[PDB]
């Protein structure tokens with residue numbers, strides 16, 4: 001509409017994100033388009049405008065600001081602040097494991113975003129490193145797109161809770177060691193989460209403090225009620241695990 005599409009980057013759940021120039025507002029923004037009018041159906045319509053409304057209610061600074069949303073030309077849009085940086089997924093591939101304080105710094109900011117989300121009643125079922133965008137000075141945003149996998153999934157999700165705390169702890173693990181806690185294929189991984197002994201990160205890389213195994217053990221403890229209640233408490237413990 002008032003916008004003019006540009007480079008296809010980002011691949012959200014229901015929509016596909018483009019970079020876009022807001023010609024009225026005279027700035028470059030990220031714009032998600034729920035493409036091809038899949039939500040002619042009111043069930044998609046109301047849902048993706050319900051959580052769009054909760055998204056722009058958020059005030060936490062590690063969540064992308066929402067500029068605007070509504071309809072133009074039948075198409076439902078969400079206009080948001082454009083951010084630069086790389087995936088945690090991209091970092092890890094290209095940089096190996098992170099120095100623990102860096103890992104912690106990143107986990108702290110995303111857990112913060114997650115807590116805020118939960119608090120406004122838009123709980124994320126999980127986190128992928130591919131949903132973590134690291135900017136200038138290790139500033140990280142939680143984004144809802146790419147450019148879900150079993151590597152980061154709590155067991156309670158497979159049958160009949162806040163599962164994001166579990167996910168974040170897998171993500172923390174990966175930042176430390178270099179790889180997700182459970183390897184193998186979808187079957188063996190799914191099983192590993194239900195059953196395999198939680199890994200002890202210090203037993204992999206040299207420079208990882210002991211206190212962390214406890215954090216990971218708690219953070220991806222088997223019974224949901226044994227884990228941290230917030231990502232904040234995760235963060236706190238993680239932080240405290242630097243000697």
Ligand SMILES: [Br-]
Nearest residue numbers: 086090091094
């Ligand atoms: Br990088």
Ligand code: NA
Nearest residue numbers: 115118162231
């Ligand atoms: Na949470």
